[PDB]
């Protein structure tokens, strides 16, 4: 405790992601809508916009 000038706890967390070849497991909280067929529509299948 007398070390009032020496640093502070700096707990670090590191993640690893961005493969996308296998089916995804952790996916973002975005709403899902019905699909439209036979139309030039913007699709966002699992992130492949």
């Amino acid at each position: 405790p007398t070390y009032g000038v020496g640093h502070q706890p700096y707990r670090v967390v590191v993640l690893s992601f961005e493969l996308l070849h296998a089916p995804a497991t952790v996916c973002g909280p975005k709403k899902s809508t019905n699909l439209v067929k036979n139309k030039c529509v913007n699709f966002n299948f699992n992130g492949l916009k």
Binding site: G47, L48, K49
Partner: protein, 49 residues
């Protein structure tokens, strides 16, 4: 004996195939897909990417 006429067709086809296959090059970028770069990165470095 019609090799002279076939050579032109083969050369044109192979040149066009090389041109269309060149789209997979990374050219030093992280990915070869514009949509992935735009989605995973902010504009400030996406511009040079």
């Amino acid at each position: 004996a019609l090799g002279k006429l076939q050579d032109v067709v083969n050369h044109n086809a192979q040149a066009l195939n090389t041109l269309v296959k060149q789209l997979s090059s990374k050219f030093g970028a992280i990915s070869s897909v514009l949509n992935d770069i735009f989605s995973r990165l902010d504009p400030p470095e996406a511009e040079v990417q």
